[PDB]
């Protein structure tokens, strides 16, 4: 009665470690990942301190190796000062992340020339990923063409963005992209329920026409990724609400509900949560790793999922059909019906595996 | 000095077993595969007898398990009589192959209605592959749309075909395709050297404009595959020359030469010989499996490669830069500098592995 899936990959998560101000860490975030059927995560570099140099990467590597319950890779972050300085550690990271719109001071790039410098100095065979909204998508595509290499666009959220990427792909340009579940299953219509605090996210929630454009152009979407961005309700309901939603535990149930409704096929889902993440970021296989899901149980998303320390969710009240029953990670039972059974530190840095290095010419 | 590649996959080979008239068999063909850096092959069903029913599949399965030196999956072949009869064995095959142009009597389909019947009865989650030339590509795409499922087009060889597939992909249609090395590295200009016998292949060799269109539209090509079709020179130079080239041992050296010349990147190559074959046919990973190549040695392709029993090659005289030095298959040294070190029967049917079944809804 259960369906066996491969180990699913989430290439866009914020686990807030290193850092001292948030409740989420590698241990709680990867517990949430396992409960969502996710056995490998790529963690973003906008931590405190941000992962913008080799010492910060070394610290984060050890914190994750000690806390992670599933396997992982860590992004490096582009800064106004580190272009040309990351060559010796670049291969050990998931890739390079550029924050091209709003971000905090250490990751801010003040000029497209700084984008160009990163595209020119980052090793050409390694992934580059960009937070790029609206016209910024076109701008970074231009920089990628000027430097003759590929780029991956995070969380595409608008009709404008997906149609631009569609046009670029039709001209044969090397661009891939990812879409997050809140931009497929939430819209402006939900802001009345969520309110202006909880509803804050970047890219912002789109119109009904944005959501319909993403579904209509599913063929253009290479990956799904949660953009798990945990903040507590104390932050979201405060005077300066930070943007972001938690999403590791809800993403697969939401997408399996869409499969059961015929909105996409099981294959469409597995291309975007397994095969394409593997090939875009050259993430290695996980031996003896699989997820068992139950597609019969209908349940309502509660006010908070059990594991993420965010302790809230914007999908509260939505009806879903699909449950993660069991996760096996490298031969060990990692999750069964609401209980995580692997300790912090079970997870490993996949870039240190022999099959986890990105191939390159000598 | 050596470059480590993952285990490469060739999704289109003819190994002539079962059969009694050709010299190639599973043991010699998979030896040729290993020498070409290929650790997994998918074998086509136009054998003698053809794999068009469960008893023929059962025989071929055991012959391959006893003779194969690398891992494999076996295609089923569509016939005018077997639509609706393959449901119980379909999941054990690589996929279903339709011969929509020239073929021998048992695999001939006399009507598009017979194509429709196969698209309607073959399980919707399992791969369908088609030999479809020129307008036949458009026709089978129409049948795929009428039945609301995907199709993979074998050995695309013409500007006409790749531009049609490009247009279909731009409308979001689920079509993938493969291109063989002889349609990238040989053209009509080589028929003077090859002659009308050796030059016989289906799809036929294209014009210089066909070859240039395939390279210009590399973004449209999902996979490379050899279409290894061994015939001896006694057949090729006879009165009724059968179509086909051997190609397992030459494909990777040819493509690595193009990489060294900047015609495509190493990543472009590995998407088309590893990642995309995996995701289109849902082929499982091979643990502890990798290929070591030497990109410095320049050599001239001889009159015949050492292993294929075809004992000739159409690429004789071409200069290449790139050599397979070592292949490791599931922890065992399989090939080193011209010596195959795994015996017949080392290879396994990947569809029998737990990770090798195609996911499906209950
Ligand atoms: O780190 C976060 O919380 C965050 N939240 C968002 O909504 N967009 C971001 O780009 C981001 F970095
Ligand atoms: O089996 C063969 O030899 C063969 N040779 C070709 O050139 N085209 C085919 O479609 C084929 F089935
Ligand atoms: Zn972002
Ligand atoms: Zn993010
Ligand atoms: Zn916060
Ligand atoms: Zn890879
Ligand atoms: Zn690798
Ligand atoms: Zn063919
Ligand atoms: Zn063939
Ligand atoms: Zn023959
Ligand atoms: Zn698969
Ligand atoms: Zn599988």
Mutate which of B3, B150, B264, B265 to test chain A, going by most A C-beta atoms within 10 A?
A: B265
Distance A292 CA to ligand 12 centre (A): 12
Q: Are strands A3-6 and A290-300 parallel, antiparallel or unpaired?
A: antiparallel
Is there a contact between A188 and A158 (Cβ–Cβ < 8 Å)? no
Task: Extract the tokens encoding B290.
Answer: 């990798």
Report phi then psi at A118, rounded to 5.
Answer: -70, -45
Closest CA to A31 of A303, A357, A310: A310
Q: What CA–CA distance (Å, rounded) separates B79 from B76?
A: 10
B262 close contact with A: CB closer than 8 A? no
Q: Is residue A135 part of a domain?
A: yes
Q: Is residue A221 part of a domain?
A: yes
Q: Is residue A72 part of a domain?
A: yes
Closest CA to B185 of B125, B253, B133, B244: B253
B227 has catalytic annotation: yes
Q: Is residue B107 part of a domain?
A: yes
Chain B CB contacts of A285 below 8 Å:
285, 287
E runs forming strands in chain B: 3-6, 8-13, 38-43, 71-74, 76-77, 96-99, 128-131, 151-153, 175-179, 223-224, 290-300, 319-329, 332-336, 339-340
- Name the closest residue on chain B to residue A220, using Cα atoms: B172
Is there a contact between B329 and B46 (Cβ–Cβ < 8 Å)? no
Q: Is residue B357 part of a domain?
A: no
Identify the residues whose C-beta falls under 6 Å from ligand 2: B 14, 46, 131, 201-202, 229, 242-244
Binding positions of B for (S)-dihydroorotate are 16, 46, 202, 231, 243
Q: Is residue B361 part of a domain?
A: no
Q: What CA–CA distance (Å, rounded) separates A125 from A91?
A: 9
**CATH number of the domain within which A340 lies:** 3.20.20.140
DSSP structure string for B105-172: GGG----HHHHHHHHHHS-TTS-EEEE--THHHHHHHHHHHHTT--EEE----SHHHHHHHHHHHHTT
Closest CA to B177 of B150, B205, B149, B142: B150
Q: What CA–CA distance (Å, rounded) separates A331 from B106?
A: 45
**Which residue is closest in CA terms to ligand 2's atom 2?**
B229
Coil, helix or strand for B5? strand
Q: What CA–CA distance (Å, rounded) separates A1 from A296?
A: 9
Q: Which ligand is nearest to the CA of A358?
A: 7
Inspect the interface and report whether the beta carbons of A271 and B287 lie closer than 8 Å. Answer: no
- Total tally of structural domains belonging to chain A: 1
Q: Which ligand is nearest to the CA of B355?
A: 12
Would you say the C-alpha torsion A188, A194, A200, A202 has a positive or negative sign?
negative
Please list the residues that pair with B228 across neighbouring strands. Answer: B13
Write down the residue that tokens 């990973």 correspond to. Answer: B285
Q: What CA–CA distance (Å, rounded) separates A142 from A184?
A: 27
List the Cα angle A77/A81/A85 in 5-degree steps. Answer: 75
Experimental method: X-ray
Task: Tell me which residue range forms the domain holding B50.
Answer: 3-351
Q: What CA–CA distance (Å, rounded) separates B225 from B243?
A: 17
Q: Is residue B321 part of a domain?
A: yes
Interface A:B, Cβ pairs < 8 A: 78
Expressed in Å, this structure's resolution amounts to: 1.7
Distance A234 CA to ligand 5 centre (A): 9
Report phi then psi at B56, rounded to 5.
Answer: -65, -40
């Amino acid at each position: 009665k259960l369906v066996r899936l491969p180990g699913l990959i989430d290439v866009h998560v914020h686990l807030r470690e290193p850092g001292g101000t948030h409740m989420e860490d590698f241990a709680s975030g990867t517990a949430a990942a396992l409960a969502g059927g996710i056995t490998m995560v790529c963690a973003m570099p906008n931590t405190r301190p941000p992962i913008i140099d080799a010492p910060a990467l070394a610290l984060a590597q050890k914190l994750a190796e000690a806390g992670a319950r599933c396997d992982f890779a860590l992004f490096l972050g582009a800064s106004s000062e580190n272009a040309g300085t990351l060559g010796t550690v670049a291969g050990s990271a998931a890739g390079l992340k550029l924050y091209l719109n709003e971000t905090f001071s250490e990751l801010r790039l003040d000029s497209v020339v700084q984008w160009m410098e990163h595209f020119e100095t980052w090793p050409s065979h390694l992934p580059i990923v960009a937070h790029a909204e609206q016209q910024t998508v076109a701008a970074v595509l231009m920089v990628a063409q000027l430097t003759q290499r590929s780029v991956h666009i995070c969380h595409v959220a608008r009709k404008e963005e997906i149609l631009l990427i569609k046009a670029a792909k039709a001209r044969g340009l090397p661009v891939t992209c990812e879409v997050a579940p809140h931009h497929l299953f939430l819209s402006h219509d939900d802001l009345e329920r969520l309110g202006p605090g909880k509803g804050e996210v970047r890219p912002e929630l789109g119109s009904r026409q944005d959501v319909e454009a993403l579904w209509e152009n599913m063929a253009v979407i290479d990956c799904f990724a949660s953009d798990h961005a945990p903040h507590t309700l104390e932050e979201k309901c405060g005077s300066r609400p930070p943007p972001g939603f938690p999403g590791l535990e809800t993403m697969l149930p939401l997408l399996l509900t869409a499969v059961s409704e015929g909105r996409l096929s099981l294959d469409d889902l597995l291309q975007r949560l397994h095969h394409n993440p593997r090939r875009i970021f050259h993430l290695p296989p996980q031996e003896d790793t699989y997820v068992e899901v139950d597609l019969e149980h209908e349940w309502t998303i509660p006010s908070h999922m059990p594991f993420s320390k965010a302790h809230w969710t914007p999908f509260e009240g939505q009806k879903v059909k699909g449950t993660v029953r069991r996760v096996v990670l490298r031969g060990e039972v990692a999750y069964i019906d609401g209980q995580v059974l692997v300790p912090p530190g079970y997870g490993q840095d996949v870039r240190k595996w022999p099959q986890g290095a990105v191939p390159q010419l000598p």
